[PDB]
Design an enzyme around this catalytic site. Structure first.
Site, mmCIF file in Angstrom:
data_model
loop_
_atom_site.group_PDB
_atom_site.id
_atom_site.type_symbol
_atom_site.label_atom_id
_atom_site.label_comp_id
_atom_site.label_asym_id
_atom_site.label_seq_id
_atom_site.Cartn_x
_atom_site.Cartn_y
_atom_site.Cartn_z
ATOM 1 N N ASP A 17 -10.061 16.658 -45.295
ATOM 2 C CA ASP A 17 -9.159 16.468 -46.608
ATOM 3 C C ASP A 17 -8.810 14.817 -46.881
ATOM 4 O OD1 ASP A 17 -7.253 17.217 -48.781
ATOM 5 O OD2 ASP A 17 -5.881 16.573 -46.401
ATOM 6 N N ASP A 19 -6.667 13.396 -49.568
ATOM 7 C CA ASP A 19 -4.875 13.517 -49.546
ATOM 8 C C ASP A 19 -4.630 13.242 -48.500
ATOM 9 O OD1 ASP A 19 -5.743 11.957 -52.381
ATOM 10 O OD2 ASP A 19 -5.187 14.225 -53.252
ATOM 11 N N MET A 49 1.795 21.277 -52.891
ATOM 12 C CA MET A 49 1.633 21.574 -51.591
ATOM 13 C C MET A 49 1.846 22.793 -51.048
ATOM 14 S SD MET A 49 0.133 19.028 -50.778
ATOM 15 C CE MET A 49 0.248 17.033 -51.184
ATOM 16 N N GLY A 107 -8.366 18.235 -53.824
ATOM 17 C CA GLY A 107 -7.862 18.640 -55.059
ATOM 18 C C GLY A 107 -7.608 17.709 -55.735
ATOM 19 N N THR A 179 -3.030 24.592 -47.679
ATOM 20 C CA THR A 179 -4.417 24.185 -47.773
ATOM 21 C C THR A 179 -5.752 24.130 -46.533
ATOM 22 O OG1 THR A 179 -4.434 22.100 -48.907
ATOM 23 C CG2 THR A 179 -3.641 24.303 -50.049
HETATM 24 CA CA CA Z 1 -3.304 16.871 -48.047
#
Ligand code: CA
Length: 221
Positions: A17, A19, A49, A107, A179
């Protein structure tokens, strides 16, 4: 640690991931700052989130507040580039030196994530992220809604794509949020990351959780 190192060493692909994991910031929140709408956007980013809302709509809502121009994204990269999380440079280096395939899944937006990948020697082919559209004059034109990362569950969809394309035997997903935890399955294993912000519900539920990328650097090289 020990069992964590054994799991880590068995991977032939690691997906990060972006971010709050590979970088300290949230790409979209930083673009919101550069564009003057940080407060509103950063709340919506919080609202989204986790597995909390329909991602595609939350992304549209936020991009509609931001309306990033090509030059604004360009300025973000040049003048306000995101900060790599301490240790990620070295970790990705150790992974690549072991021929582990490293991917970034976000994302956020390809323009920014490709900048981060370049700093990590991750080829653009290994970046999965949303793509901003712009009109001829640079004005915000929307985003590519066909991207797996534009939908809820996009990280898991990316990993499925990678498995089908490359037949990796052991893909580990590494990230800070629900996620990312929810991408295993189809990932083979998940390591939660709390070096930037601890998401307690990930830390409480993940089998593997680290707060410092050095913890995976289980040698001396
Ligand atoms: Ca993240």
């Amino acid at each position: 640690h020990s069992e964590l190192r054994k799991l880590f060493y068995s991977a032939d692909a690691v997906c990060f991931d972006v971010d709050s994991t590979v970088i300290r910031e949230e790409g979209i929140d930083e673009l919101a700052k550069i564009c003057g709408v940080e407060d509103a956007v950063s709340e919506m980013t919080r609202r989204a989130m986790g597995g909390a809302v329909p991602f595609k709509a939350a992304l549209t809502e936020r991009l509609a507040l931001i309306q990033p121009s090509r030059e604004q994204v360009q300025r973000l990269i040049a003048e306000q580039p995101p900060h790599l999380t301490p240790g990620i440079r070295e970790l990705v280096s150790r992974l690549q030196e072991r021929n582990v395939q490293v991917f970034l899944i976000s994302g956020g937006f390809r323009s920014i994530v490709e900048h981060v990948a370049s700093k990590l020697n991750i080829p653009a082919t290994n970046v999965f992220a949303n793509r901003l559209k712009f009109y001829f004059n640079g004005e915000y034109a929307g985003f590519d809604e066909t991207q797996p990362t534009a939908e809820s569950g996009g990280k898991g969809k990316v990993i499925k794509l990678l498995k089908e394309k490359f037949h990796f035997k052991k893909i580990i997903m590494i990230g800070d949020g629900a996620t990312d935890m929810e991408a295993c399955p189809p990932a083979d294993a998940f390591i939660g990351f709390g070096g930037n912000v601890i998401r307690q519900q990930v830390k409480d539920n993940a089998k593997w959780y680290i707060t410092d990328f050095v913890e995976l650097l289980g040698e001396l090289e």
